[PDB]
């Protein structure tokens, strides 16, 4: 037997879990979320260099 | 050595050397629990 305790603190923490992803589509209206940024718009390449 | 004794870890991290002539410059901020390191060899 396993027993699992789930102590939420205020301190940080990493928010745990198996967050999925689609395939990434270009050139076309879609809506999306990165990484927690969400919008709705048309993703293609960039020459933005970061 | 240092630390001969230590109980209660709660947290570990290993990444390539912070300093690996150069300046070394470091920011150290903690933000909201988040210990925030910035810097510039």
């Given amino acids: ?50 | 050595g240092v630390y001969s004794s230590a109980n209660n870890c709660t947290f570990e991290y290993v990444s390539q050397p912070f300093l690996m002539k150069n300046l070394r410059e470091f920011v150290f901020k903690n933000i909201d629990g988040y210990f925030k390191i910035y810097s510039k060899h």
Avoid: D, I, M
């Fill in chain 1, 1 to 50: 037997v396993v027993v699992l305790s789930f102590e939420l603190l205020h301190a940080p923490a990493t928010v745990c879990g198996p967050k999925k992803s689609t395939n990434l589509v270009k050139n076309k209206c879609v809506n999306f979320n990165f990484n927690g940024l969400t919008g709705t718009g048309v993703l293609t390449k960039s020459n933005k260099k970061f």
